[PDB]
């Protein structure tokens, strides 16, 4: 039988306030959870999880067959040329459960100076139909700028526990130019499951997906009650417990990258469990020119070997790698 995780919940609330002592405090456990098992849950986050969980079965349960080819990615209709990472990422029945809707920045509009030069890996976000929809595109909107909140204090909470002055990443985390997005995922419940939508592991578990480390700074994800994740560590893998009133937090290969794997990006799986479920992550991504030079906090010097490497660039090569390792989601 398997391992739980050390996952621990700490409390984030320091990282909105002023009282710097006990930022450093909530700072030290992040580092602890950091360099441990790589996960931990963010609680009082201030987040109306209950809402978002709720908004987001409305738009699931009720969304069409005719809606999801009309916002589909260019990888389920080849008509949406631009839309390689925002819209709708279909199931296809008998062979692949999951389904999802992923939306970028708000602020890429038509008019915004990156959609204007076609930069790589901007989008202008699609929404169903308003009257279809009532106050969907609101409430997404409003979540990306609630997680965004939440975000950026996360990562003076990072920043500090490297040793950093407390915006280190978070002047780069902007609402004008960030890459980040937000993925609803529907894993459904049926019967019969559909074999091909489940993947053994070489220790003989199923899953729905497999092993990877995240495309990301760090990742800010709320689930659903259902246990259902497992990180790889020195004893083998461990499940994740669920918590649905926190954020489960990890760090992406972005981090590694900056820190000379001091911070690793923790490898993780999704066990197959038949049951209706949600997984909502916010990816925490910088702008597309951010370049922060790598360091190495285990250095007296803080010097690393590792060359700079912007975001943007780091973003489409691991976006591209992410797809042909573990498959179109
Ligand atoms: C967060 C956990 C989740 N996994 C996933 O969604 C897997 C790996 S984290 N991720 C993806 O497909 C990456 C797409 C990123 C998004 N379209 C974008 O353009 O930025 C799961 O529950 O399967
Ligand atoms: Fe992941």
Same mark, same amino acid.
């Given at each position: ?111 915004? =100076? ?5 930069? =790589? ?17 609101? +409430? ?13 204090? $996360? ?13 280190? +990443? ?35 578990? *199923? ?40 954020? $489960? ?14 911070? *690793? ?15 909502? =992550? ?25 060359? =700079? ?21």
């Amino acid at each position: 039988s398997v391992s739980k995780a050390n996952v621990p919940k700490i409390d984030v609330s320091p990282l909105f306030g002023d009282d710097q002592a006990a930022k450093m405090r909530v700072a030290q456990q992040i580092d602890a959870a950091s360099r441990d098992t790589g996960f931990f849950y963010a609680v009082n986050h201030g987040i109306n999880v209950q809402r978002l969980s709720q908004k987001t079965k409305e738009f699931h349960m009720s969304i069409t067959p005719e809606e999801k080819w009309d916002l589909a990615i260019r990888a389920y209709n080849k008509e949406h040329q631009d839309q390689v990472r925002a819209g709708y990422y279909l199931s296809i029945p008998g062979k692949k459960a999951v389904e999802s809707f992923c939306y970028l920045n708000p602020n890429f509009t038509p008019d915004h =100076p990156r959609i204007q030069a076609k930069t =790589p890996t901007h989008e202008v976000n699609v929404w169903p139909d308003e009257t279809k929809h009532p106050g969907f595109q609101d +409430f997404a909107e409003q979540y990306y700028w609630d997680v965004f909140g939440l975000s950026s204090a $996360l990562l003076k909470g990072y920043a500090l526990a490297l040793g950093k002055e407390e915006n280190f +990443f978070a002047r780069h985390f902007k609402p004008d130019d960030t890459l980040a997005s937000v993925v609803l995922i529907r894993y459904p419940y049926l019967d019969p499951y559909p074999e091909a939508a489940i993947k053994t592991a070489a220790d003989g578990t *199923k899953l729905s997906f497999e092993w990877h480390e995240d495309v990301s700074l760090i990742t800010v994800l709320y689930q659903s009650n259902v246990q259902n994740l497992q990180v790889e560590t020195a004893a083998g893998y461990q499940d994740i417990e669920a918590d649905d009133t926190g954020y $489960l937090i990890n760090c992406g290969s972005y981090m590694a990258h900056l820190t000379n794997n001091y911070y *690793k990006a923790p490898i993780h799986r999704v066990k197959w469990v038949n049951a209706e479920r949600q997984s909502l =992550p916010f990816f925490v991504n910088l702008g597309y020119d951010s370049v922060i030079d790598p360091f190495d906090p285990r250095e007296p010097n803080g010097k690393s070997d590792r060359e =700079p490497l912007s975001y943007g660039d780091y973003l489409q090569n691991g976006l591209v790698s992410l797809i042909n390792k573990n498959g179109q989601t």
